[model samples]
Target: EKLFTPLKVGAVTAPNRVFMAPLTRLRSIEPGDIPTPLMGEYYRQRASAGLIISEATQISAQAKGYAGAPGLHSPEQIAAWKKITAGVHAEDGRIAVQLFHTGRISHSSIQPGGQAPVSASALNANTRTSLRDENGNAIRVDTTTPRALELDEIPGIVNDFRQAVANAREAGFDLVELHSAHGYLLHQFLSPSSNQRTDQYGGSVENRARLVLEVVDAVCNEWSADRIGIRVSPIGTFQNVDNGPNEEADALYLIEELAKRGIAYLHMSETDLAGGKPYSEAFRQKVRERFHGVIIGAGAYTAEKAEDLIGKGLIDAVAFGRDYIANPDLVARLQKKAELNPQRPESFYGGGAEGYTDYPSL
Candidate 1:
């Protein structure tokens, strides 16, 4: 697989083919979503990855999901990211930021003014989010009510992504990735189950996917095509997102549309309709057939399996999330064929450096 071989992603150059996909760290400063210095040191140590896709960053207050994930709309937050990028570059590693929005996945506690969650449609149900009540007990809250975003509000959502890109540039990021997949705000609009609008923005598959495409265009204009990448979780039913009867067909269209845009790369999550299902090799083949760019496959991948996928040309690279969380020097270990450290589920969500950055690479 030549994991350490240099690779080119659109306009950016990676020293190796190994990549670190964006994972939620929830390490931002309270009330400000400002990046912390510990995060800088955290990424600086993982410079071994050829390309580092930063943790998902919210574009606006309405898009905020987790309590500690950072944002790009404020000057102080942007400054924090600049510090992070400077640190990574000093280690000779390239990085990309994932612009994200949670839609109904947000909570009043996180949004400014305790506003109601906004989505493409008013349909409300389970959203799969954790929160701590005033009593300090962890609770899972479902989306009880969500207001349908007006047509005018749609542009504002897209603008947030563009502005985030502009801010990332000011913050010294080498590239920017739109988090269109993962049942986020953009994804909420794409899934028919979540988006049931009768206006031009809803209905047919093309119409539903329009928002994501528009977002891609906006961010691409703000940055460059070569500096933009996108992550998609087509079969991902998280937050109760169903692709509909023609799921594969519609998902293929999304990938083809992304290819037409000449995006630098595509990060695909090979998930079954249900969570914890085995990786679908057939879907991987189908995606490799459709996408000519640097296709990336992730989710529960081991070193030998990833290398086999790369060796067979099924994918150009692989991204490991939990593995990276516990093993900061994932690339070095893979290069040496060393054993990996198992992640501690206990410290996964709310923690400082203990579960976040305390993993030894060796």
Candidate 2:
């Protein structure tokens, strides 16, 4: 099948088109947000994937949004990720580290020194984020209102991405994906509803995309553009963020700029997990025209769907999320038409190996 074919994605040649999507399994050791040995073992088991995109890791203390999610900032975090990347490499599996900042999708409890989260503009997603109770249990709390980022503070945030790429290289990641999707920091900047500034970083689509472009260029200083990728959700109304009228045009402009930069891949999530309106064929065609590099389509992808899309030239690869969580050898199972293990959504977060590494493989 076309899904089983090899494809050269910039510096790395994926053995198959069945790549693993980045999933936030918040199993990191807290207090420092470090990846544990269990997490390393988890990725090692799923090393059969064409490429494993590690979960959305925070780029800095100020970037953290979740309670137990891992980070790529500190020395300990980098050292912890090193073991995980080494394990994936040991199995000859290519891996990419995904970096993100939560923006307004965060609470002051999760922020540094209980400061309000900084976003493109002063806005609230009106959604909840995960935090822990005094007894050390997961609790869903409403996201606090964020302050608009000062123009001078924007450069520091860009530098955060640059430093993260440098740390990713030290951690032995094959590629690094900027998590500009799912209503995160970059998405907050890109979305007109969230970004209400009249300054150079807002207003027009070019202005809204300036921060994302600057971040890409900053990271490119530390890593090669050929080894970098970005994820974007153009129409997905994640959290309470609105999918306004101009979002499609805005995202297309960003894709064009990325094409100009000669980046490796574009991970376009069609919509949120609840399955919002799918990106139309015309939109995909528009993307195809703008970006000629690798395009990986995500969000509730099935094996047959992957085969159809890969055969149709709509996407270069398919990234499986929940299916990958349940079946570590998802590629092997899909190839053989084998049954998949059902995922336990209840234990998807803040859990031990029961719902995580304990998932059996055929």
Candidate 3:
């Protein structure tokens, strides 16, 4: 099968084209937001995947937008992830750590000292984010209005991501994937609707694209560009941070720049969950003209859909998110045309072995 062929992605040669997308299970141990032995076992169980992009990890305490998500900032967190990376590597599995900051998608309850979350502008998305009540139960709360990030403070934000790259490397991850999608900090800056600053980071497409590129360059300096990859949602809306006027122009420019840098990969996190349109054929053709690297298409993918797209050279691989949750051996299942286990939404987050590591393999 074409999906079972080996492919070269940056520094690692993936054994197959069936890759496991980064998933947010919110299963990290609290106090310091560290990974657990259970997480190690979970990744080890899915090591047969061509490449395993770990869950979206917090770059710093300030970057943390969710309560149970794992972090890569502190010493304890790094030490904890080292074990998981070792476990995956032991089984000859390649893994990448995805670094992210939630920006305005956070509430003061999730911030340090209950301070307001920061964003590109002082606007309120008025969206809902998960928060834990005093009783440790997950509750939905409206996001607080975020304060605009000062021009001087931008460098610190860039450093947060760059430092996270070093932490991921120190923790034994083979690659680092920056989370520029999902209305996170980088997206907040990218979207003019969210970023209204009159400074260098606002207005034109080049200005809005500056911070993401800066963060990318800073991290690439810490590690090699060959081991660096990034994720972007050119047309997805989240947390009320929708695409602005120059959305397509900004996205294409960013892709072209990353291609020029010769980064390892470009992960397009496309979705129609909000009843939005998927990437049109014309836009896909434009992307092909610009980026010629490893492009992974994620979200709502079927094995047949991915196979056809790969055959057409539209996408090199498919990152199965929910499928990977219920089918740890998703590559084998797809290759053998075996049946897949149904995913349990009830245990999708903040769960134990039931929906996590215990997923039976063929």
Candidate 4:
């Protein structure tokens, strides 16, 4: 019953406490990074969620590193997303667009003009990237070494996110989430192992957290803090990220700062790369001590576990990922205690309508 109650997430009140987590299926159209009508139908089908966090969308061409991911930099891309948002709203659903930049976890083949991806430092992510080669074939290759971002260029990157917030508002998104986790650009800056800079942007916890705070501050100038949210992966080692020995402390410090800003919600991924270990209860307690705002916990959660966490006061809501992909009517099924359909991994990414909108609802 608590999971089905109305909850306030910043400016919007979610109908329930079951939100749809962001999933990157890589099914967007190419040649300008646009969203297709197929995506609109997919979101419409999953409108039962209290809040739908759309897939990780790039804020600019330089922000993009994966093939087939959607963007919000261009006018065409913004126009395309409007339809998707409108469809969700027509179903009385609330949706938020997640702004992401892959940073060093990219290959030159996927960069603009085949340039190397940029990051906090010149270190390599030591991870593979998904790209489509000539003839439109899907290929997985190792990520290339990334160039270090200069101090002057950092403001431009922040502005890119600022403009993206404006674009998301124009696209009819009720909220915007900054993707600062997953070893991406902002997380790269946050992690001491990834950022070895000696400048003012690195060295201490405040320095490492400067860029993310700047971007958040810049966006706050354009939109109310309550209309924004952030996603973080404190202990995640995906994409070869090392949060260093002080990761937990650093994360709590950063979160404390964010809490002071009065942002909408804090979405934390307990695990990364599917089978990794989750954060301990001690760490969760530390987070609760620092921040009193709404918190969303994600990572392979079931309805019972979600309800338990909410009942225990650990998290305000639970985000469902794979289950939402397989069952669009997951909320209804959970309420009725019905079985869920299994997700088809084979047709998960870069596909037409097979594994996307073809799932049946009970």
What C-alpha lDDT do the candidate models reach, one value each? Answer: 0.82, 0.88, 0.87, 0.89
**Model 2 alpha-carbon drift over 4 Å, by segment:** none
How do the residues 1-362 of candidate 2 rate in per-residue lDDT, one tens digit apiece? 88888989988999999989999877788789999999999999999999999899999999999988999999999899999999999999999999998888889977879989999888788888888777666778989999999989998999989999999998999999999888899988888789899999988888888999999988877778898999988876876665568777777778899998899999988868777887788988899989978999999888888888788787899888899889999989988999999879987888688899888999
Off by over 4 Å in 4: 135-137
TM-score of each: 0.94, 0.98, 0.97, 0.97
lDDT score for candidate 3 against the true structure: 0.87
> What is the clash count of model 4?
0
lDDT of 3 at 332: 83
Query: What residue pairs clash in candidate 2, if any at all?
Result: none
Q: Candidate 1 overall Cα lDDT vs. reference?
A: 0.82
Sorted on TM-score, best first, the list reads 2, 4, 3, 1
Which prediction has the highest lDDT against the true structure? 4
Model 2: lDDT to the true structure: 0.88
List ranges where model 3 is wrong by over 4 Å.
Answer: none
Over 4 Å off, model 1: 132-140, 272-282
Q: Report the lDDT tens digits of candidate 1 across residue range 157-200.
A: 88888888899889999888888776778888888888889998
